[PDB]
Each structure stands twice: as structure tokens, then as C-alpha cells.
Structure 1
Amino acid sequence: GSHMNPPPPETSNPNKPKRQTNQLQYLLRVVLKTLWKHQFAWPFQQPVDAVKLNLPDYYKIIKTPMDMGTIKKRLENNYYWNAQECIQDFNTMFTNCYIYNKPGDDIVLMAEALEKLFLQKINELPTEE
């Protein structure tokens, strides 16, 4: 991709600790699966390509980018140690969108629909066993 977009967030790193948990399995099998097929998921399925979108200031503003494509790879590659790390990635993705864009913009309404779905599923995140 373009040299003007940063490398994506890390999805593989042998030095970082990781494990499976039933909560992480739920995040992949229920949470990510639900959000990924939503009508409004598509803009969130890969890193923001600020060159293609003509958003030259994006990576000046957003210093902790995150997207569902990255979260999917982190879940499928067992990158995480715990659910909190993955929930934080989702929350970063939503808050980036709300910080960068005007309230009421289409992309914000899209993120808000995904976040509504997310919160319902996270309220049912299973007890860690």
C-alpha cells in the first residue's frame, strides 16, 4: 500500500503473551461475527486508507488506529491475552470515528449502529471459565 499510510497495527508477534480464553472465543464467534455482517460494517473491515479517501490529516489526528480487519486477524491468530485487550480495540475503533468525524456524519451513524450491537453482545460476555 501507499507509503503515506502507516503500517497496520501488529497482528503477529512471538514475543507477546497470548492465550485462549472462552471470552476471546465468544468475541470471535459471536461478537466479531455479528458486527462483520452488519449492513454498515464495510468501512470498518480494513484500516483507514487516508490516501484513497483524501483524508491527509487522518493519521495526524488518529494516533491509535484500529479496524475490524485487524481485530479479526488478532482473534484468528490468537494475539490477545484477555478479552479486555480485544474490547479495548473495538472501543478504540469507535472512538476514533467519533473523534475524527462530525456528529451525525454518515460514517458516525454507521459506527454507532455497530456500537449498539457491540454493547448488547458484550453485556452477555460469558463468565471466564
Structure 2
Amino acid sequence: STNQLQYLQKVVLKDLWKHSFSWPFQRPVDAVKLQLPDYYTIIKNPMDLNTIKKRLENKYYAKASECIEDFNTMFSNCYLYNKPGDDIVLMAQALEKLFMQKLSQMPQ
């Protein structure tokens, strides 16, 4: 559905980006820059808001469910790599909460 894909692009992604905690998720985790020796090894499918945004712009997704899967991968990647109480985890959870709320207002 291009309608749901449009909502994910114009509402969900925009609103997550506006959130004050979005900045660490705004581009791929650059494991060389951040000195994370194991990240590319154990996180099999890195994902971020900018990749999702480019894919929606390029009409890469066929259904909204594939775009939603990328959002969930971005969040679970962060939980899987990090530890409870980490600040990055606290930011991801606030973003996931917002994501979960805006999905509840998805049309169709």
C-alpha cells in the first residue's frame, strides 16, 4: 500500500527524526569511527533512519510491512548490541515508544 508507505514516510519517519533523541540513529553506526571492533561482526543487518528514508524515497519497499521490519531491526540491533541502562538504549526506547504510538494512527 502506497498510502501506508506514504504515512510511514511523511508522519512516522519525520516525527521520529524530529525527536531530540534521534541523532545517534540518523546515519549508520560507523563502527570504525566509534571503535566498535565487533559491531559489523555480530549485528548482521545494520539499519538506521537515513537508510529507511532513502529506501522510501527510492520506492524500495513493496509493502509497509517491509519498512516496519526495518524500523524494528534498527531498534533491536541497538538493544542486542548494547546493555540495559545504556543511554543509547534509553534513547532507542523513547524513539520506539513514539514509533509505536504513530503506528497506532496508521490509516487503512
Shorter-normalised TM-score: what interval?
Answer: over 0.9
Larger Rg: 1
Query: 2:56 maps to what in 1?
Result: 75
Unmatched 5+ stretches in structure 1: 1-19
| Distance of 2:107 and 2:60 partners within structure 1 | 20
Q: 1:41 aligns with which of 7, 22, 25?
A: 22
Match of 2:104, as an amino acid? N
Query: 2:104 maps to what in 1?
Result: 123
Q: 1:107 aligns with which of 88, 93, 103?
A: 88
Give the structure-1-normalised TM-score: 0.82
Give the structure-2-normalised TM-score: 0.97
| Distance of 1:110 and 1:123 partners within structure 2 | 20
**Cα distance, 1:104 vs structure 2:** 1.1
Match of 1:56, as an amino acid? P
Query: 2:41 maps to what in 1?
Result: 60
Over 3 Å off, 4+ runs: none
| Distance of 1:73 and 1:101 partners within structure 2 | 26
Unmatched 5+ stretches in structure 2: none
**Cα distance, 1:96 vs structure 2:** 0.3
Match of 2:69, as an amino acid? Q
**Cα distance, 1:52 vs structure 2:** 0.6
Q: Output the aligned Cα RMSD.
A: 0.8
- Number of residue pairs the alignment of both structures matches: 108
Q: What SS class does the counterpart of residue 51 from structure 1 fall into?
A: helix
Q: What SS class does the counterpart of residue 25 from structure 1 fall into?
A: helix
| Distance of 1:124 and 1:37 partners within structure 2 | 18
Match of 2:94, as an amino acid? A
